[PDB]
């Protein structure tokens, strides 16, 4: 492994057709028999596991001891025919025989698996890099053909990236993706975050915001993976049928500490299922609620429950009320333990980067414009400011950066460290008392700033007050609107055109007020809604009553104000009133209301079209390097090749995590360069409109 | 065939065979397929309308029972909003169908108590359940066909 | 239909339409 | 797939397919990996001989 | 159609440079091409 690492480090930085790669393949040819023998060893001891895991080989096992005879061993690998006769003889020589002609298949497979993994991966990386750099190499074709099973087995662990950082030349970098990283990436918890991020970054559209939010999402995703790893392991019949159909369509002393930890893990694992079942209990309690009836006297208005089989459902609502309350409180605990760390990490990172570059407090001019920026002040003084963030030396780094200019002693008291003696001692080298108050006030203040936590707190208030009046559980029915995506879009369509909607509502109010003014000034005689002549009720003699009547009847009816107006037949102002009624109809019923309706339905249509356009733009071009699929429709099955190998999105987060894991001194030239480039917070290593094929199409073949 | 055989048992059942015109013509096939093309959003939109009318009917039962008289004769006052089930059925049958809000069915306010709260409730019902939900259903269906 | 309700409605309308 | 499992071990399986020799192709393709007897039992053929 | 016109005004202004016409396409290959182009190279106010 050290040999091949040295070899591929020597080859690193070569051009598509360089003397280094030509001598590489020439030397590989010069040891054709030896490299072929090594590749054969790898191939046989790799296909060994596939042979042994197959059911065909398992069928030949004929011993309760679980050990197969040498004769049956040879017969099984003759039936498979993957291994040649001399190869089977060599494997028999390699067998760990127990002197009874019986060899353990499992031990023989597993013993030679772990040590050869790294070297097999490195050899696969070397062969792939030679094939990619020099395609027109007939000699290398034979070696690539012999390296068939090893490459296939190590392909899922292998990943390729094409960052460009040196001499404006695009190059390829290979690394190892561990099974744990990909397995945890396959978790749908981070898949939903991937969907949300890929929607949000495309929605924003900022040129630098693309890479900036990409790296921010990568850091947040890594933090979420850390949290997951730390936490893992008659009318009644018709009404019942309608409720069932709706549900179907919608659905489809240390022991105390140990118990607390177990309870927290249990709540965090199934927070989402807890929310779903809480929604179902809300449905059930509202349905049970659907059977009330009022009467004059108790069995002094009485809200008394009555239906068939009272014992089935009257205690049911009573018990499910408490059950829903307890479930919802557990939901709060789970949300506090699950996602609040993620948002606090976001805010910590944002404030730290602002303090570093924008220097919000080294300039000490927040401006009090934003309440969040003002509330950001109290937490710097706490020593536990950077604890949640992976980095905790940002305060010291900013001190060393800017204390020569603004005064080291000035920011010594500002950023919360004890003194310069604190850094001097750092260089020199009860739990209740460890809790810092101001950090906790800042923490729960930003908890009370987030929208989701306030929605859940309002849920708490409603659930707790539902015992005051059982009808208050109808507020929990809004989770359907706040749940499934379609109703979330429906609700957001109302707020999407909020400015236009409220302005046109104000315009309608202005028009109706003007019409009320003229109606009072001229037509106060006609508004006679009374029936008995003894006590007439003039609907329009005061401004407020007339305006309220107009807003209540004229807009709502649709026929106009003239529906409630007495018929203007054979009287003065008949034409002056037919004009008024026709213009009321034409300016309040057919235009303004139609304008509002069109605004709402077009906002919803635009939201749906944007949602579809996000998915479309997802495929029209790759957003990492801003390259369309036109260059790859020129070849069969091309854009899939780009997405899978050239500029794959999933492999970048694996690359960042692999950079995080391994130590600094083992970084190669490309790895160290990209580490430095990320540390400087400058993003030019990304391809940025230049793929490898664009540069090397002439010799790509 | 099953409908046709049923038709011999009762001729009335032959009317169901008239739907073949829809499959005969491409335009009619598209017209019927419009409903099932965007049925997912339509079902949840109907559910949202049901939820909203349920909220409004529980509000009316809690505070507006005395305005829901529908019987002209005073000898037998028929309280339409006397129970949750009856009030909800009455709303979902009359208010949405009228198109002009529940004010056509509810006795008009005469300056009594809760007059402002009554007019706010009626205007917000009209707005939300007429200008928004029904319009969205219409637009969704016509836009799917288009 | 009192002074308070009309005042609140007008205040909200003016606050929205001022900007 | 659960329903189409029922038509595997019966004669005249490719009644409408142009190729009536798909059984031999499937055998020659996968019998070495999956055993001749297992493929013979699955496909409904009498025997390899 | 009116609202589409006001939206199109902003869209065309943001995707094309008024002074020289074409923009945000050839400059897009260079990082931050359009922003630098409109700030320094081709700006409406600097001509006045
Ligand atoms: N860097 C990228 N550039 C362009 N397209 C990409 C990139 N990474 C992924 N894709 C696209 O992702 C598609 C795969 O999406 P798919 O339908 O499998 O689900 P997904 O929403 O990505 O979720 P998951 O794979 O986690 O189940 C590919 O067809 C490809 O077009
Ligand atoms: N000749 C031009 N002059 C100004 N902006 C231009 C020109 N050509 C293209 N643009 C684009 O228009 C944007 C500015 O347009 P506009 O005047 O509508 O914005 P603004 O909000 O008033 O500006 P800012 O907030 O940057 O002061 C530029 O950032 C650029 O993307
Ligand atoms: C430990 N660690 C991280 O966890 C990390 C990081 N950059 C991003 N993340 C998430 N760096 C540089 C780091 O050292
Ligand atoms: C005889 N025959 C067919 O009958 C056939 C076919 N491809 C499809 N069909 C139906 N080929 C290639 C073929 O040779
Ligand atoms: Ca080194
Ligand atoms: Zn690319």
Curated annotation (Swiss-Prot), chain C:
Full-protein residues shown: 4323 to 4341 of 5037
Please name the gene that encodes this protein: RYR1
The UniProt subunit note reads as follows: Homotetramer. Can also form heterotetramers with RYR2. Identified in a complex composed of RYR1, PDE4D, PKA, FKBP1A and protein phosphatase 1 (PP1). Repeated very high-level exercise decreases interaction with PDE4D and protein phosphatase 1 (PP1). Interacts with CALM; CALM with bound calcium inhibits the RYR1 channel activity. Interacts with S100A1. Interacts with FKBP1A; this stabilizes the closed conformation of the channel. Interacts with CACNA1S; interaction with CACNA1S is important for activation of the RYR1 channel. Interacts with CACNB1.
Q: Which tissues does the record link to its expression? A: Detected in skeletal muscle (at protein level). Fast- or slow-twitch skeletal muscle.
Taxonomy, top ranks, is: Eukaryota, Metazoa, Chordata, Craniata, Vertebrata
Q: What's the family?
A: Belongs to the ryanodine receptor (TC 1.A.3.1) family. RYR1 subfamily.
Protein purpose: Cytosolic calcium-activated calcium channel that mediates the release of Ca(2+) from the sarcoplasmic reticulum into the cytosol and thereby plays a key role in triggering muscle contraction following depolarization of T-tubules. Repeated very high-level exercise increases the open probability of the channel and leads to Ca(2+) leaking into the cytoplasm. Can also mediate the release of Ca(2+) from intracellular stores in neurons, and may thereby promote prolonged Ca(2+) signaling in the brain. Required for normal embryonic development of muscle fibers and skeletal muscle.
The protein, known as:
Ryanodine receptor 1
Q: What is known of its domains?
A: The calcium release channel activity resides in the C-terminal region while the remaining part of the protein constitutes the 'foot' structure spanning the junctional gap between the sarcoplasmic reticulum (SR) and the T-tubule. Pore opening is mediated via the cytoplasmic calcium-binding domains that mediate a small rotation of the channel-forming transmembrane regions that then leads to channel opening.
Q: Where in the cell is the protein located?
A: Sarcoplasmic reticulum membrane
Please tell me the species this chain comes from.
Answer: Oryctolagus cuniculus (Rabbit)
What's the domain of life for this entry?
Answer: Eukaryota
Q: Share the record's PTM remark.
A: The N-terminus is blocked. Channel activity is modulated by phosphorylation.
Note in the entry:
Binding of [3H]ryanodine indicates that the heterozygous channel is activated by Ca(2+) concentrations 4-fold lower than normal. Single-cell analysis of cotransfected cells shows a significantly increased resting cytoplasmic Ca(2+) level and a significantly reduced luminal Ca(2+) level.
From Swiss-Prot, chain E:
Subcellular location(s) per record:
Sarcoplasmic reticulum membrane
Question: What PTM annotation applies here?
Answer: The N-terminus is blocked. Channel activity is modulated by phosphorylation.
Tissue specificity statement from the Swiss-Prot or TrEMBL entry: Detected in skeletal muscle (at protein level). Fast- or slow-twitch skeletal muscle.
Q: Where does ATP bind?
A: 13-18, 38-44
Q: What domain of life does the UniProt record list for this protein's source?
A: Eukaryota
Query: What binding partners and quaternary form does the record give?
Result: Homotetramer. Can also form heterotetramers with RYR2. Identified in a complex composed of RYR1, PDE4D, PKA, FKBP1A and protein phosphatase 1 (PP1). Repeated very high-level exercise decreases interaction with PDE4D and protein phosphatase 1 (PP1). Interacts with CALM; CALM with bound calcium inhibits the RYR1 channel activity. Interacts with S100A1. Interacts with FKBP1A; this stabilizes the closed conformation of the channel. Interacts with CACNA1S; interaction with CACNA1S is important for activation of the RYR1 channel. Interacts with CACNB1.
The note filed under miscellaneous reads: Binding of [3H]ryanodine indicates that the heterozygous channel is activated by Ca(2+) concentrations 4-fold lower than normal. Single-cell analysis of cotransfected cells shows a significantly increased resting cytoplasmic Ca(2+) level and a significantly reduced luminal Ca(2+) level.
The UniProt entry's sequence similarity note says: Belongs to the ryanodine receptor (TC 1.A.3.1) family. RYR1 subfamily.
Cited function: Cytosolic calcium-activated calcium channel that mediates the release of Ca(2+) from the sarcoplasmic reticulum into the cytosol and thereby plays a key role in triggering muscle contraction following depolarization of T-tubules. Repeated very high-level exercise increases the open probability of the channel and leads to Ca(2+) leaking into the cytoplasm. Can also mediate the release of Ca(2+) from intracellular stores in neurons, and may thereby promote prolonged Ca(2+) signaling in the brain. Required for normal embryonic development of muscle fibers and skeletal muscle.
What remark about domains does the record contain?
The calcium release channel activity resides in the C-terminal region while the remaining part of the protein constitutes the 'foot' structure spanning the junctional gap between the sarcoplasmic reticulum (SR) and the T-tubule. Pore opening is mediated via the cytoplasmic calcium-binding domains that mediate a small rotation of the channel-forming transmembrane regions that then leads to channel opening.
Protein's name in the database = Ryanodine receptor 1
Q: Which organism is it from?
A: Oryctolagus cuniculus
């Amino acid at each position: 492994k050290d040999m091949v690492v040295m070899l591929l480090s020597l080859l690193e930085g070569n051009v598509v057709n360089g003397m280094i790669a030509r001598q590489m393949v020439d030397m590989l040819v010069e040891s054709s028999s030896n490299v072929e023998m090594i590749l054969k060893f790898f191939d046989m001891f790799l296909k060994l596991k596939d042979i042994v895991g197959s059911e065909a080989f398992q069928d030949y096992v004929t011993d309760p001891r679980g050990l197969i005879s040498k004769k049956d061993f040879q017969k099984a690998m003759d039936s498979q025919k993957q291994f040649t006769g001399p190869e089977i003889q060599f494997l028999l020589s390699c067998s760990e025989a127990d002197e009874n002609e019986m060899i353990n298949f499992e031990e023989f497979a597993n013993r030679f698996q772990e040590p050869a993994r790294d070297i097999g991966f490195n050899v696969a990386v070397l062969l792939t890099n030679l094939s990619e750099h020099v395609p027109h190499d007939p000699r290398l074709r034979n070696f690539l053909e012999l390296a068939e099973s090893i490459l296939e087995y190590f392909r899922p662990y292998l990943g390729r990236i094409e960052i460009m950082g040196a001499s404006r030349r695009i190059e390829r970098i290979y690394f190892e993706i561990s099974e744990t990283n990909r397995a945890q990436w396959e978790m749908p918890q981070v898949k939903e975050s991937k969907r949300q991020f890929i929607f949000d970054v495309v929605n924003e559209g900022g040129e630098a915001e693309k890479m900036e939010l990409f790296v921010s999402f990568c850091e947040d995703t890594i933090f979420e993976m850390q949290i997951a790893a730390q936490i893992s392991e008659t009318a009644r019949e018709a009404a019942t049928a309608l409720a069932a159909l709706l549900w179907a369509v919608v659905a489809r002393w240390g022991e105390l500490e140990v118990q607390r930890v177990k309870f927290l893990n249990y709540l965090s694992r199934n927070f989402y299922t807890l929310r779903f079942l809480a929604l179902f209990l809300a449905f059930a309690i509202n349905f049970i609620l659907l059977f009330y009836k009022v009467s004059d006297s108790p069995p002094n208005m009485v809200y008394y429950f009555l239906e068939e089989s009272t014992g089935y459902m009257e205690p049911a609502l009573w018990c499910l009320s408490l059950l829903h309350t307890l479930v919802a409180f557990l939901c709060i605990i789970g949300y506090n333990c699950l996602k609040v760390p993620l948002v606090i990490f976001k805010r910590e990172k944002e404030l730290a980067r602002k303090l570093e570059f924008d220097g919000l407090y080294i300039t000490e001019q927040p401006g009090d414009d934003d309440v969040k920026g003002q509330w950001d002040r109290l937490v710097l003084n706490t020593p536990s400011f950077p604890s949640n963030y992976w980095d905790k030396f940002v305060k010291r780094k900013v001190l060393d950066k800017h204390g020569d200019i603004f005064g080291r002693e000035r920011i010594a008291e500002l950023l919360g460290m004890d003194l310069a003696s604190l850094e001097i001692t750092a260089h020199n080298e009860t739990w209740l008392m460890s809790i810092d108050v101001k950090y906790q006030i800042w923490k729960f203040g930003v908890i009370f700033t987030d929208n989701s936590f306030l929605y859940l707190g309002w849920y708490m208030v409603m659930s707790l007050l539902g015992h005051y009046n059982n009808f208050f559980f109808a507020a929990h029915l809004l989770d359907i609107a706040m749940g499934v995506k379609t109703l979330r879009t429906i609700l957001s369509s109302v707020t999407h055109n909020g400015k236009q909607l409220v302005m046109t509502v104000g315009l309608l109010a202005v028009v109706v007020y003007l019409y009320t003014v003229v109606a009072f000034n001229f037509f106060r005689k006609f508004y006679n809604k009374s029936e008995d002549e003894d006590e007439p009720d003039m609907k329009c003699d005061d401004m407020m009553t007339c305006y309220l009547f107009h807003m209540y009847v004229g807009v709502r009816a649709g026929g106009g104000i003239g529906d409630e107006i007495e018929d203007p037949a054979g009287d003065e102002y008949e034409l002056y009133r037919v004009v008024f009624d026709i213009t009321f109809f034409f300016f309040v019923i057919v235009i303004l209301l139609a304008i509002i309706q069109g605004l709402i339905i077009d906002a919803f249509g635009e939201l749906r079209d944007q949602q579809e356009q996000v998915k479309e733009d997802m495929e029209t071009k790759c957003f990492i390097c801003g390259i369309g699929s036109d260059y790859f429709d020129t070849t069969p099955h091309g854009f899939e090749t780009h997405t899978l190998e050239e500029h794959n999105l999933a492999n970048y987060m694996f690359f960042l995590m692999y950079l995080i894991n391994k130590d600094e001194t083992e970084h190669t030239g490309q790895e160290s360069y990209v580490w430095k480039m990320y540390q400087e917070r400058c993003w030019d290593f990304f391809p940025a409109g230049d793929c490898f094929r664009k540069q090397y199409e002439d010799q790509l073949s």
